[PDB]
Amino acid sequence: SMNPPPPETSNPNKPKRQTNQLQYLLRVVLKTLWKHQFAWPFQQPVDAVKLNLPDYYKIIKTPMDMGTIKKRLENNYYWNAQECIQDFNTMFTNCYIYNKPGDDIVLMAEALEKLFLQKINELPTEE
Ligand SMILES: CCn1c2c(c(=O)[nH]c1=O)[C@H](c1ccc(C)cc1)C1=C(COC1=O)N2
Numbered sequence: 001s002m003n004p005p006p007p008e009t010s011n012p013n014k015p016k017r018q019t020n021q022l023q024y025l026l027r028v029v030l031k032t033l034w035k036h037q038f039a040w041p042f043q044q045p046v047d048a049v050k051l052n053l054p055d056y057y058k059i060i061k062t063p064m065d066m067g068t069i070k071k072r073l074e075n076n077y078y079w080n081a082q083e084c085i086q087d088f089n090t091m092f093t094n095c096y097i098y099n100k101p102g103d104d105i106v107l108m109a110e111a112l113e114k115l116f117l118q119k120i121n122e123l124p125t126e127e
Pocket residue numbers: 040041042046051095098099104105
């Protein structure tokens with residue numbers, strides 16, 4: 001099978017705005033996770049073709065990744081912070097569903113998610 005098209009990262013028909021919370025998600029939350037030693041499997045859409053995982057997109061129908069999130073934030077694609085938080089959660093959940101508990105990639109995701117949840121407790125109040 002071919003890869004699917006990646007998630008959209010811009011849409012002229014989708015209203016957009018900047019908020020202090022979305023700015024924080026880009027400058028602090030994404031920045032922190034993106035540069036983490038365990039980030040690399042999550043920095044781009046899953047390339048099931050190159051990686052040889054012919055069942056990935058038969059199993060995962062809600063793909064999401066930090067490369068997509070990074071572009072959505074940079075492009076001001078989101079209207080609210082919850083949209084972005086949901087994308088991170090979807091990314092982690094996909095990993096936990098596709099892979100076996102105890103697999104190294106699951107441990108990587110869990111470490112990233114722990115950090116993620118800490119940082120979103122620090123979300124600033126909306127101005
Ligand atoms: C996020 C998508 N994904 C990936 C892999 C996987 O086993 N399961 C999976 O859900 C695979 C891999 C294998 C072992 C480790 C320690 C990390 C990553 C892999 C990537 C990218 O490069 C790769 O070697 N992604």
